[PDB]
Structure 1
Amino acid sequence: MENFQKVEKIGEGTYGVVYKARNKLTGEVVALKKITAIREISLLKELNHPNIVKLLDVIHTENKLYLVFEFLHQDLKKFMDASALTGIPLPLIKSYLFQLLQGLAFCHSHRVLHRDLKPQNLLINTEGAIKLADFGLAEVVTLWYRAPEILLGCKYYSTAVDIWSLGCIFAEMVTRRALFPGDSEIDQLFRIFRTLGTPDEVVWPGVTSMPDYKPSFPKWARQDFSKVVPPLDEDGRSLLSQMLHYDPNKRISAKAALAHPFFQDVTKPVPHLRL
């Protein structure tokens, strides 16, 4: 747009393309994303929290829509890829998890869901902050962080879907491998079932009456969490287990998760970021 000078292409998305850009007015360095949306997006402009990437402005113009965001220098996917020989130190993982849970507790209190949390939409800065990006906005779309209720075809899913996605990210930080790297919808589902056990009416009341549930799904037994995320300690395994409960109603809320004993000794480390 007239008021912005493109600096470089950050990336490419489900909807549109993302540029690092400078405001010739404010001097401001921002990220520009080019794609009843107007009213929904306007509502996102007021959803302000230290752990949500600030939506600065919305520009509708020429049947194109531009979202102007706060710019951050790195995403968690890149930071995980760069930290993979060493692993992200546990106090930083814990700090990131806690902050994201704060962000989620906020948005969820306002009945706003992210719906597509993934390392790529978690942005970090040199100060040790992490932020939820592309919030309430909802190449091959990644399935790896999708909650089972979405995969089984629930139309009216809840905030719990974000807790699921964040649990998957927690596990990946800890182990340095994706928890459930599905490359199709059924592969994603069956990867979950192979680890967590095929769900049934005992652990998830109503599951067998979900739109895409099939009685023909193979019945796999649950694995122990000790095997899933070693060497994460008993507090973290406990918390992760609660974020990965099948029944969205049993699944821990962000607000309750913040009170979990895992965070008794949370601190805010500085990451080593090479930009």
Structure 2
Amino acid sequence: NFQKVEKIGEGTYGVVYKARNKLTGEVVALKKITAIREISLLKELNHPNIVKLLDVIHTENKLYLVFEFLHQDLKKFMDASALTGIPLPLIKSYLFQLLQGLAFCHSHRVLHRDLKPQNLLINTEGAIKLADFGLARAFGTLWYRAPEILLGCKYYSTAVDIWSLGCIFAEMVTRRALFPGDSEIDQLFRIFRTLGTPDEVVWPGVTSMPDYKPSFPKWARQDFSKVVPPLDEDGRSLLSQMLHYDPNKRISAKAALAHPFFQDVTKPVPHLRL
């Protein structure tokens, strides 16, 4: 019933295929993986910045998700733009849209928990969409992981997606990953080395988190101007609020949309080689 066109890739739950409905002619993305009920609820989520979950297929005791198809992800686009960099107006537009998507999902009590360039999809009209929202909770790369997760907190908040987005924001600007850790501790220490080793002053409760060790080295925080040059102060300001250690102090998606950084936001058209 579905015609395997090509392997889009390998996800976190299963393998992804570009597929054609051998009846409707529809071109879709197919992912082969209490969960049934939960992901079925996700079908109701509709937002221009969220990849549409078309249908949930539970058959032969196996689970397929049918998604709206988009041709390119942010990862491939960043690689293709690595020489020149993505223009600031397009970076700003993408960030603005992504925050809209987060704000919508967060208002409906849906988290992503696993944001990364590979699940951010773009099209020819200058739109960008979040894929895999709510899949983490339903079904039960460390670079974009929030520090509270790395410190073994069992209870996640919307703030984890904001951290991830912040990391992706910085990566778009510098054309290099912000915290490319190769293990949980390397990831953690890369964060510490840049933002300063967290303490009770900046993050009340941190020394009581399950995987926190008093034996953590004490790195001083470095100037933000060194981290995302040559982003202007509006952008650096927004980023620092997205990268607060304390998830309670970390800026929400709705508040982020009101940041002065987005005062001159537009919607440019990217040139894609599809």
- Structure 1 length-normalised TM: 0.97
Q: How far apart are 1:63 and its partner, in Å?
A: 2.0
| Structure 1 residues 83 and 139, CA gap change in structure 2 (3 angstroms) | farther
1:19 Cα deviation after fit: 0.5
* Contact 1:13/1:139 (<8 A) preserved: no
TM-score by length of 2: 0.98
Helix, strand or coil at the partner of 1:138: helix
Query: How many angstroms apart in 1 are the aligned matches of 2:137 and 2:191?
Result: 23
CA-CA distance at 1:25 after TM superposition: 2.2
Task: Give how far 1:74 is off.
Answer: 0.1
What residue number does 2:106 align with?
108
* Aligned equivalents of 1:56, 1:4: Cα separation in 2: 14
Q: Deviations over 1:73-97 (max 9, x none)?
A: 0000000000001000000000000
Identity, % of aligned pairs? Answer: 99
1:62, CA displacement in angstroms? Answer: 1.5
In the alignment, the residues of structure 1 paired with residue 38 and residue 153 of structure 2 have an alpha-carbon distance, to the nearest angstrom, of 22
- In 2, distance between residues paired with 1:122 and 1:199? 30
- Partners of 1:14 and 1:139 within 8 A in 2: no
CA RMSD of aligned residues (A): 1.9
Deviation at 1:27, TM superposition (A): 1.2
Is 1:32–2:30 an aligned residue pair?
yes
Structure 1: runs of 5+ lacking an equivalent: none
Please give the per-residue CA displacement for 1:128-167, whole angstroms capped at 9, x wherever unaligned. 0000001111099x00000000000110110000000000
Question: Could you tell me how far 1:24 is from its partner in structure 2?
Answer: 1.9
Q: Could you report, residue by residue, the CA deviation over 1:234-266 in whole angstroms, capped at 9, with x for unpaired residues?
A: 000000000000000000000000000000000
In structure 1, how many angstroms separate the alpha carbons of the residues matched to 2:28 and 2:243? 35
Secondary structure at the residue paired with 2:4?
strand
Question: C-alpha deviations, 1:170-190, integer Å up to 9, x for none?
Answer: 000000000000010000000
Preserved contact between residue 51 and residue 129 of structure 1 (Cα < 8 Å): yes
Q: Supply the distance in 2 between the matched residues of 1:66 and 1:40 (Cα, whole angstroms).
A: 14
* Greater CA drift, 249-258 or 12-21: 12-21
Residues 139 and 119 of structure 1, relative CA distance in 2, 3 Å threshold: farther
> How far apart in 1 are the matches of 2:263 and 2:12?
38
C-alpha distance in structure 2 between counterparts of 1:25 and 1:58, whole Å: 17
Distance in 2 of aligned mates of 1:85 and 1:76: 15
Moved segments of 4+, more than 4 Å: none
154 and 90 in structure 1: CA distance in 2 versus 1, 3 angstrom threshold: same
* CA distance in 2: counterparts of 1:267 and 1:187, whole angstroms: 37
The SS at the match of 1:157 is: coil
Measure, in 2, the Cα distance between the counterparts of 1:138 and 1:104: 15
Distance 1:182 1:139 in 2: 24
Aligned residues: 272
- The answer to whether the 8 A contact 1:35-1:64 is kept is yes
